[PDB]
RNA sequence: AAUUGAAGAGUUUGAUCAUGGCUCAGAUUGAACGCUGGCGGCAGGCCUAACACAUGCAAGUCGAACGGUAACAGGAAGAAGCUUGCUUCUUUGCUGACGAGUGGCGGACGGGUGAGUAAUGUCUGGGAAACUGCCUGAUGGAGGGGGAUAACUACUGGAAACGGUAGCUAAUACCGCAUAACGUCGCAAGACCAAAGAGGGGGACCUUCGGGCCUCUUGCCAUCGGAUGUGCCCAGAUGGGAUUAGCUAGUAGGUGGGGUAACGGCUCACCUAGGCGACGAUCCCUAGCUGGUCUGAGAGGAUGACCAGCCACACUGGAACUGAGACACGGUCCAGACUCCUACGGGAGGCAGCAGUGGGGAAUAUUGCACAAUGGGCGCAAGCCUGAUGCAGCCAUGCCGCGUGUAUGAAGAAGGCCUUCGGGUUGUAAAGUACUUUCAGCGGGGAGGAAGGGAGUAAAGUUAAUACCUUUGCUCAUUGACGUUACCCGCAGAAGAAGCACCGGCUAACUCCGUGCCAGCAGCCGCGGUAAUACGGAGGGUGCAAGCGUUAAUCGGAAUUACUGGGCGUAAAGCGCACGCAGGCGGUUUGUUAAGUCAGAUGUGAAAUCCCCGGGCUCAACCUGGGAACUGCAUCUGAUACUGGCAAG
């Protein structure tokens, strides 16, 4: 297939853009305990679709903005 | 950097003879061995464990005159290879040129032996070599230069060394000095008064 | 050696690559040369032309402003020790 | 800082460019260095024919 | 202009070379694309003195490489029939 | 310094004198086109765009302006006029 | 075959066991210093002030682009000596060559340094919206004309640097025009864009006697790809401080114009009121990063010199030009500071390029030799240039090899140091005897590092031509900086060549004399108060060795930062106690997902370095073959226990 992430929608107080958060359960280098290492990405999407709290397939693309360089594929798990 | 000092004084510091001044007087009479290395060597110490490791390290050193910097290289080399480091240390040390010169009987003492080797009078395997720390590789041969042959040092080495035990893993021509060296030196084919775990324990730290 | 050769028009430097007989030039480098030295051609016959050494006359003394300049005092006057024949240091 | 003057009979004075190497002089409180004799204006010791690598005495002529 | 030249290794008076494919602008012993074979000029009598990777040198030809002087001469010294 | 490749200085000065003139020749033709787009009269905008097109493509052959920049300036003009009329 | 690998001791107390720091035994160094010092090989050699720099060199080449020729040598009609062809010279760019210039290509590479830089960078693994001289493959063309302008000329300005004025000739210089396509733009139809000629040989036709004509060699411009390099985006990793809590205002995103090789707030206009932050934002201090080096059993700790990749800077700060590529070390312009020339008007330059200097400092080299080999620039090539590089010099700084002799030799010498005074020890150590004689000193031989390239010749190509050019064998004469080389052979002779530290315990090794808490020793504990194995001097003895100690430095030992691998009642340490958000962890059952996890595959993990089995310098250090390794990371396909997410109980 192609490189695509899972993420979670965080900051949608703006237009045609979203800051997603993707969780990384990495292993600590020296202490061996798994830490919930967060990662936040300015991700471009199409016209204002979703809200907060929904897992969102997102793939790498052109640098559409200064920071936004990823594209939202689809919205999964709509909730309250 | 060789040793260049009074010779049997090391043997009286080690008690026994390490065959360092064999020569014509093949009996150690004018030596007063064991109880007089110095003005106060007429007594005995409690001789701690560090000392008994060091004095044993000194004996294996003094038969072949290996300086510590050169000596430590063998321990780095023996532990590098396979097998036992106690066995490998002496095995690679037996391959020294003056050691095989002595084991084949071309020299009656190692100082007399190395004087032949350093003055490039030995054509080992087809090439004259003047550096005594040359590894005499397994399954080989060693010849002597004919144009510097038999100047009364070789014949006296031929006389005395044929009275002394006739070594095992090699063959002496005994007519015109054509030494052949065949196999790997085994732990059982040794002087056996030396120990080995005294050395490799000291060199761990 | 012979590093660089200069014709020396009153402490002005023009480069000389070859010197003939009878000309004056300055040889730059020359670590151990003294006054009136007979520089000859080696791997060849060696010549000599030097016989004179003039007189010293009045000896005075000195002491610098501090002792931190005393290493330069022996050096800079030692720098002057190489130059003049009739100028000694005690 | 302070420093210790090893040996005996030093020709030191009010100003002398000397050289300093570190080392605790434990019996002296608050002195942490040793002047190396064999250096600059702090000259060598006399009658120190033994252990002369420290104190900078040369080998006697023979 | 990627070339196939020599890079000098070894000690003083006892040289050694490994013929390498590199970008010609770069230094001699520096950044190279790929080592392809080696060469010994003081190759004492053992048969191994050169082991040239002939097929990639033939492959780099199609990619537009400029085979240098002695590198081409070593191919003429170590022929294409042996 | 006084290296004898310092003619590259004056070889660049006559080069820049050649360039900036011909560089402005391009830009001024773009100004005439852009003035017509502020004007809006179509035939004046079309003919000017049909005038400077041989001028733009020619300097691409001389390499003073990159081909894609020259391709951009074609795509700039025709997009502005078509949305106008 | 490729990790066969981990020690402890002294010290609190009258004595003991612990807790617990301090210190030593080991290795290592870009080391300095003290004393000593014979040679060779491979190495390394400004760590501090990115402090300021004198001088010589560090980047030119092209005549196969062109007008020309200022030098040099020529055939050359001739000049004059006058030994009538022996020569002094005048013609002359018509030859081989060639400054000064126009033009082409390079100079953006190599070489240096680590100030800045805590993330614009770097290492790792991926991506899409590009550009890419030279080298390369394919598909075609390569028509026809023009105006100036150096150079150079006549005048003239200046001390030079450098000009200024009026004429003048060429170009593979520049500028149109023709003519376009698998090219650019455009929904489309269509519109528009390029190019240059030089060098060799010659049958025959034509020769305005140049040439055209043919062939060959090469260059040229357009389009789509290769290769290489380059710019760019994204995820993670990449220091110390919270006595650094809020931070930001083109700042976070949209839209449209412009910009950009290409993407984007890149840059403005207008709108939206957001973006980053406890997984540490912002701020201050320090620092180039990495492969790796050192140590360690390993995990980690310290570090980033030399060699190699990357990045940044080029006197300080700012900007742009040119060009394939620079916001440019040895380019331009401007501002500032600092120096140099001067005729006083005006100009010139940047060692953080190789040496070299003053200075700073404990601390570091020669203004050296050759373009012979490797590499690079330009060129058809020959060749030219090359402080890259190869080499030489100085310096034990380091690692490695070697020597200063061997054997014999007892009156157990003399002498010294002792002596329970009888002897013992130094010590077979010296002398003397007989031999060996490396390296050094000296005289002769002697590799290889050298492949090429030059002229000729034969052959195959080659074309209308047996010519040219190209390839191929072939012969001759040659190419060596280093370099009286590596190495070898002989001569004379034991002869030119051994020190430094320690000796109370730790720790291998003791007596005597002097000295009396003095003089001093000392890493720690501690010695010296008149019998000191610890102080200094002898003698003796031990360690190490062309080095040996001292200091500094890092890890070790130190399980005294404890991830592997520590503690908290009294030894240092439970907040005085409680509630509680973030956060950490979380009973049990089924279903589901595969994030974590594990298995297999793939790409990569640059080379070197490190390790193993080998090979070459006589050995070794050292150079070097393959392999292993690089324990990682990313992607892809699976397994469903355990942990997590989700749904239900």
UniProtKB/Swiss-Prot annotation, chain A:
Changing residue 28 to P: In neamine-resistant mutant nea301. Gene3D superfamilies: Nucleic acid-binding proteins. One of its GO terms (molecular function) is small ribosomal subunit rRNA binding. One of its GO terms (biological process) is response to antibiotic. Keywords: Antibiotic resistance, Ribonucleoprotein, Ribosomal protein, RNA-binding, rRNA-binding. Disulfide bonds: none annotated. CDD domains: Ribosomal_uS17 (cd00364). One of its GO terms (cellular component) is cytosolic small ribosomal subunit. The keyword Zinc does not apply. Part of the 30S ribosomal subunit. The strain missing both S17 and L29 grows very slowly and has a rather unstable temperature-sensitive phenotype. Belongs to the universal ribosomal protein uS17 family. HAMAP family: Ribosomal_uS17_B (MF_01345_B). One of the primary rRNA binding proteins, it binds specifically to the 5'-end of 16S ribosomal RNA. Also plays a role in translational accuracy; neamine-resistant ribosomes show reduced neamine-induced misreading in vitro. This is Small ribosomal subunit protein uS17. It comes from Escherichia coli (strain K12). The gene is rpsQ.
UniProtKB/Swiss-Prot annotation, chain B:
SMART domains: Ribosomal_S4 (SM01390), S4 (SM00363). Coiled coil: none annotated. The keyword Glycoprotein does not apply. Residues 95-155 form the S4 RNA-binding domain. InterPro entries: Ribosomal_uS4 (IPR022801), Ribosomal_uS4_bac-type (IPR005709), Ribosomal_uS4_CS (IPR018079), Ribosomal_uS4_N (IPR001912), S4_RNA-bd (IPR002942), S4_RNA-bd_sf (IPR036986). The keyword Kinase does not apply. Keywords: Antibiotic resistance, Repressor, Ribonucleoprotein, Ribosomal protein, Ribosome biogenesis, RNA-binding, rRNA-binding, Transcription, Transcription antitermination, Transcription regulation, Transcription termination, Translation regulation. GO terms for biological process: cytoplasmic translation; DNA-templated transcription termination; maintenance of translational fidelity; negative regulation of translational initiation; response to antibiotic; ribosomal small subunit assembly; ribosomal small subunit biogenesis; transcription antitermination. One of its GO terms (cellular component) is cytosolic small ribosomal subunit. It holds the Pfam family S4. Belongs to the universal ribosomal protein uS4 family. One of two assembly initiator proteins for the 30S subunit, it binds directly to 16S rRNA where it nucleates assembly of the body of the 30S subunit. This is Small ribosomal subunit protein uS4.
Curated annotation (Swiss-Prot), chain C:
Belongs to the TRAFAC class translation factor GTPase superfamily. Classic translation factor GTPase family. EF-G/EF-2 subfamily. This is Elongation factor G. The chain holds residues 359 to 448 of 704 of the full protein. The gene is fusA. It comes from Escherichia coli (strain K12). Catalyzes the GTP-dependent ribosomal translocation step during translation elongation. During this step, the ribosome changes from the pre-translocational (PRE) to the post-translocational (POST) state as the newly formed A-site-bound peptidyl-tRNA and P-site-bound deacylated tRNA move to the P and E sites, respectively. Catalyzes the coordinated movement of the two tRNA molecules, the mRNA and conformational changes in the ribosome. It is found in: Cytoplasm.
Swiss-Prot record, chain D:
The chain holds residues 63 to 124 of 124 of the full protein. Keywords: Acetylation, Antibiotic resistance, Methylation, Ribonucleoprotein, Ribosomal protein, RNA-binding, rRNA-binding, tRNA-binding. At least 19 substitutions or deletions in 11 codons can promote streptomycin resistance, dependence or pseudodependence; all but one of the streptomycin resistant mutations (K42R) are associated with hyperaccurate translation and thus reduced translational efficiency. The streptomycin sensitive allele is dominant to resistant alleles. One of its GO terms (biological process) is Group I intron splicing. GO terms for cellular component: cytoplasm; cytosol; cytosolic small ribosomal subunit; ribosome. One of its GO terms (molecular function) is tRNA binding. The keyword NADP does not apply. Changing residue 26 to Q: Confers low-level resistance to streptomycin and a 15% decrease in the translational elongation rate. Belongs to the universal ribosomal protein uS12 family. The modification 3-methylthioaspartic acid is found at residue 27. The modification N6-acetyllysine is found at residue 46. It comes from Escherichia coli (strain K12). Part of the 30S ribosomal subunit. Contacts proteins S8 and S17. Interacts with ArfA. May interact with IF1 in the 30S initiation complex. This is Small ribosomal subunit protein uS12. It comes from the Bacteria. With S4 and S5 plays an important role in translational accuracy.
């Amino acid at each position: 297939k192609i490189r695509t992430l899972q993420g979670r929608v965080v900051s949608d107080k703006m237009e045609k853009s979203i800051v997603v958060a993707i969780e990384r359960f990495v292993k600590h280098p020296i202490y061996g305990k798994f830490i919930k290492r967060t990662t936040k990405l300015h991700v471009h999407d199409e016209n204002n679709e979703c809200g907060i709290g929904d897992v969102v397939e997102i793939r790498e693309c052109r640098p559409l903005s200064k920071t936004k360089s990823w594209t939202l594929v689809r919205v999964v798990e709509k909730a309250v | 950097a060789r040793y260049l000092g009074p010779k049997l004084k090391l043997s009286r510091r080690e008690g026994t003879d390490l065959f360092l001044k064999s020569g014509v007087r093949a009996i150690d009479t004018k030596c007063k061995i064991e109880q007089a290395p110095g003005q106060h060597g007429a007594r005995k110490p409690r001789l701690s464990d560090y000392g008994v490791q060091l004095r044993e390290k000194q004996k294996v050193r003094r038969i072949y005159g290996v300086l510590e910097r050169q000596f430590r290289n063998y321990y780095k080399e023996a532990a590098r290879l396979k097998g036992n480091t106690g066995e490998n240390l002496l095995a690679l040390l037996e391959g020294r040129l003056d050691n095989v010169v002595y084991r084949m009987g071309f020299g009656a003492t190692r100082a007399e032996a190395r004087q032949l080797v350093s003055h490039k009078a030995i054509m080992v395997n087809g090439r004259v070599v003047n550096i005594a720390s040359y590894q005499v590789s397994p399954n080989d041969v060693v010849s002597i230069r004919e144009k510097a042959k038999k100047q009364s040092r070789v014949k006296a080495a031929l006389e005395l060394a044929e009275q002394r035990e006739k070594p095992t893993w090699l063959e002496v021509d005994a007519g015109k000095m054509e030494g052949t060296f065949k196999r790997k030196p085994e732990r059982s084919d040794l002087s056996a008064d030396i120990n080995e775990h005294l050395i490799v324990e000291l060199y761990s730290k | 050696r012979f590093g660089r050769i200069v014709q020396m028009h009153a402490n002005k430097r023009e480069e000389i690559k070859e010197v003939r007989a009878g000309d004056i030039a300055a040889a730059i480098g020359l670590k151990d040369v003294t006054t009136g030295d007979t520089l000859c051609d080696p791997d060849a016959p060696i010549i000599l032309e030097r016989m004179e050494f003039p007189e010293p006359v009045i000896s005075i003394a000195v002491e610098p402003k501090t002792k931190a300049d005393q290493e330069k005092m022996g050096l800079a006057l030692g720098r002057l020790a190489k130059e003049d024949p009739s100028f000694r240091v005690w | 800082v302070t420093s210790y003057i090893g040996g005996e009979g030093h020709n030191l004075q009010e100003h002398s460019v000397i050289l300093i190497r570190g080392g605790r002089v434990k019996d002296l409180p608050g002195v942490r260095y040793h002047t190396v004799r064999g250096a600059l204006d702090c000259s060598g010791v006399k009658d120190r024919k033994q252990a002369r690598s420290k104190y900078g005495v040369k080998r006697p002529k023979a | 202009m990627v070339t196939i030249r020599l890079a000098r290794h070894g000690a003083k008076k006892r040289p050694f070379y490994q013929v390498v494919v590199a970008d010609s602008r770069n230094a001699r012993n520096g950044r190279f694309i790929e080592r392809v074979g080696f060469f010994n000029p003081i190759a004492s009598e053992k048969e191994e003195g050169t082991r040239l990777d002939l097929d990639r040198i033939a492959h780099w030809v199609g990619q537009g490489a400029t085979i240098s002087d002695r590198v081409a001469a070593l191919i003429k010294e170590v022929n294409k029939a042996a | 310094n006084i290296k004898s490749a310092k003619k590259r200085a004056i070889q660049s000065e006559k080069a820049r004198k050649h360039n900036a003139s011909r560089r402005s020749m391009m830009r001024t033709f773009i100004k005439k086109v852009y003035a017509a787009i502020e004007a809006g009269d179509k035939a004046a905008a079309q003919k000017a765009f049909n005038e400077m097109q041989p001028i733009v493509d020619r300097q691409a052959a001389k390499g003073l302006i990159h081909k894609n920049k020259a391709a951009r300036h074609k795509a700039n003009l025709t997009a502005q006029i078509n949305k106008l009329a």
